[PDB]
Paper text:
To investigate the tolerance of the [name] pocket, two analogues of CXM, 3-demethylchuangxinmycin (dCXM) and 3-methylchuangxinmycin (mCXM), were tested. The complex structures of these analogues with EcTrpRS and SaTrpRS were solved. Consistent with its more flexible conformation and reduced hydrophobic surface area, dCXM demonstrates significantly lower inhibitory activity compared to CXM.
Chuangxinmycin (CXM) is a promising antimicrobial compound targeting bacterial [name] ([name]), an essential enzyme in protein synthesis. Structurally, CXM is a tryptophan (Trp) mimic but is characterized by a unique dihydrothiopyran heterocycle, which distinguishes it from other known antibiotics and contributes to its distinct physicochemical properties.
Residue numbers in the entry:
A (entry chain A): 3 to 335
B (entry chain B): 2 to 335
The structure:
């Protein structure tokens, strides 16, 4: 049974796209793979932010993942900084990573533009820590979005390079190739995917938005001039309408041919009304689960404590072999 | 509580008399006056590719060399860097408070880049930040280092002040402790070049574990100025070889530079190199007798490492917990 590792940023404002795409897909596969979810608070601090907000967002992310169906009995979920092995292997893998490999990262060069005032060593060194995150757990599979592909490739390079010197210490991870299938596009830019990182929040529906705000953003979702207004799937002529159908279908399960006949003789106004109802209905159940988890501090502590302990048994095993291989004197027990 | 001293050396190569005069001598001298913590920085060592068996042996060699020099485990915390996870942990956190430019301007990074151009790795680049972590973890007041670590030490003051300015007095701002004499021991055949463990010309280098007979031969061959007449006078700029030899003899006898200048009045360089030779030969001979007694007792080495890591961890965890609270990490449930 393959080991899967995902990093969860304790700062991402997750959208319905995240939830009905990757998250829903992985929630349904917790018994097929040994899934590990790691809230990467050590990665987060490469971008400076309020300390209290980072603490709060670490817990928000924990409760949100739980509300989405991550089951801490089936999967391992934990906070990165709670397992010191991440930093430890992070340092040691620096010594097997070329400076040039890090310099050629587009994530570093792109994030240098956005944060030209904090081009800090953490921003530069992020891929090595990522590499350590993955390799500690003998990970077979990493779901990555497009802008993490090069980071995963470095991880595979580091694993192979390290193995070539010392033996099969790490598993070489593979990208998880199949995509969720749900199509959720930006509400004003329906050629671009709805993204949690959009600075234009009116493109997205965040997982915690209330129904009044959902209607606001859906009602302003772009449509087509087509006279008469016809609810028909056409990603090039009627993308906006096609996006609303795709989102509704992702919410309800109804097929696109079913939805077309559902809205036969209906206007663009009612289609948005049905989308908002379906989306807010979905978000209302997620939200009540979120707040039940989120307000239960003892529960969240127990999850964090149990997850870190599960992660640690694997992480320390790998780090022990790493340190033995590199040549350190073992810590006297 | 006494003010805290922290310093480290790599279990790489063979420690030199430069390592002794720039760092190790002051470490011994400070053990009573301050609370001293001394580290074998094996995680720093691996920034230069090392044979794994040699690295493990070098760690034990270095520890026995500390003990031979007079570092006393009942006065000083002595410990191996990789035995205290908090060094790696604070290293990462402080990465996020260090500017890329501060690391690319590092003289040591550039020098090691040219020398290990086949292994210009991120550890070599990130080196100063882990060093910063090594120091700041212990609320360190003083860092006894040679002159070549000054830039590294100054970055760690910058990092500490930068972090404190955001978060309160989490760290002490450390101060360098760099000796007036012997901060930059020079190469015997090229006294304009610092004496370096990695020198391929071994006639430049006095090894602390090297055969005293070979050391005497190298010191007798040390190059000296062409002053006419020869005069044994301390002048590091114009009389580099002679002054370096005066520093070295000073480090063995404890006589001041002016007492040695008065002692060598009417004496020439041949007599000088002879005295330095006999003095260093005596010191290394006694050093190596203590070295082997410590080094051949691996169970003692193991006990020192365990006691030291445990003493170090108590202090490092206390600092790391405060760092984690300040930057906003959820604390690990206990
Ligand atoms: N020719 C010389 N003359 C005088 N002093 C010299 C000479 N060559 C070396 N030194 C000093 O010896 C110490 C050990 O050298 P390292 O190369 O191990 O030094 C190094 O590699 C450090 N980065 C180890 C370290 C890691 N973390 C620390 C924290 C505090 C202090 C030191 C450290 C050093 O003090 C060095 O300045
Ligand atoms: O930015 C992101 O989402 C990445 C954050 C991250 C840190 N460590 C890992 C390991 C696997 C996958 C990811 C990460 S995804």
């Amino acid at each position: 049974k393959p080991i899967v590792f995902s990093g969860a940023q304790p700062s991402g404002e997750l959208t319905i796209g995240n939830y009905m795409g990757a998250l829903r897909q992985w929630v349904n596969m917790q018994d097929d793979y040994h899934c590990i979810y790691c809230i990467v608070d050590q990665h987060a601090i490469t971008v400076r932010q309020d300390a209290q907000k980072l603490r709060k967002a670490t817990l928000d992310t924990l409760a949100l993942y739980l509300a989405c169906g991550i089951d801490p009995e089936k999967s391992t979920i934990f906070v990165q900084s709670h397992v010191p092995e991440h930093a430890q292997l992070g340092w040691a893998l620096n010594c097997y990573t070329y400076f040039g490999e890090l310099s050629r990262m587009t994530q570093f060069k792109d994030k240098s533009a956005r944060y030209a005032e904090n081009i800090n060593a953490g921003l530069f060194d992020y891929p090595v820590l990522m590499a350590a995150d993955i390799l500690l757990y003998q990970t077979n599979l990493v779901p990555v979005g497009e802008d993490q592909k090069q980071h995963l490739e470095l991880s595979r390079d580091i694993a192979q390079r390290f193995n070539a010197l010392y033996g099969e210490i790490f598993k070489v991870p593979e990208p998880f190739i199949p995509k969720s299938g749900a199509r959720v596009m930006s509400l004003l830019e329906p050629t671009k995917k709805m993204s949690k990182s959009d600075d234009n929040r009116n493109n997205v529906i965040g997982l915690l938005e209330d129904p009044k705000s959902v209607v606001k953003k859906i009602k302003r979702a772009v449509t087509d001039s087509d006279e008469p207004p016809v609810v028909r799937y056409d990603v090039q002529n009627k993308a906006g309408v096609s996006n609303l159908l795709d989102i509704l279908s992702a919410v309800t399960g109804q097929s696109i041919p079913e939805l077309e006949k559902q809205f036969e003789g209906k206007m663009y106004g009612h289609l948005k009304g049905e989308v908002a109802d379906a989306v807010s209905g979905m978000l209302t159940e997620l939200q009540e689960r979120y707040h039940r988890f989120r307000n239960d501090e003892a529960f969240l502590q127990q999850v964090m404590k149990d997850g870190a302990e599960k992660a640690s048994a694997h992480a320390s095993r790998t780090l022990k072999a790493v340190y033995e291989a590199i040549g350190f004197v073992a810590k006297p027990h």
